[PDB]
Amino acid sequence: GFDLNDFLEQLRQMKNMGGXXXXXXXXXXXXXXXXXXXXXXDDKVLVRMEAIINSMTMKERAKPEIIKGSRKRRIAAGCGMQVQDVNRLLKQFDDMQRMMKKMKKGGXXXXXXXXXXXXXXXXXXX
């Protein structure tokens, strides 16, 4: 299936090619609903991302749900960073694992057609 080794590969392949002005322009469908400026700083987020993924042992990378409080302490200590960044990175891998399972079960055109952008009420951003 999908692992943080496969996310390691997706990430050292994506930190090579990627930019935030070539990625926020290839879509004008979610550059109208979300602010055109909310992309990221790609170099920093993918260098932190590759740092945090590299700090992992091979059994924590191949199986991402065995990572708990002590392991996040240690991933924060080896890459010299915050337990909160490690947290929200295990959370983005959680969502993209969710989405590659939803591309796996349903066809590429049914999981690209039923994808939804939302407003809590129809007024802009509110």
């Binding site: 997706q10 990625x23 879509x27």
Partner: peptide, 18 residues
């Protein structure tokens, strides 16, 4: 291609708005 662009788009992109 098809799964390269559907990976890459929803990945960088849905990394962004959530």
């Amino acid at each position: 291609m098809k799964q390269s662009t559907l990976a890459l788009l929803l990945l960088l992109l849905l990394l962004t708005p959530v």
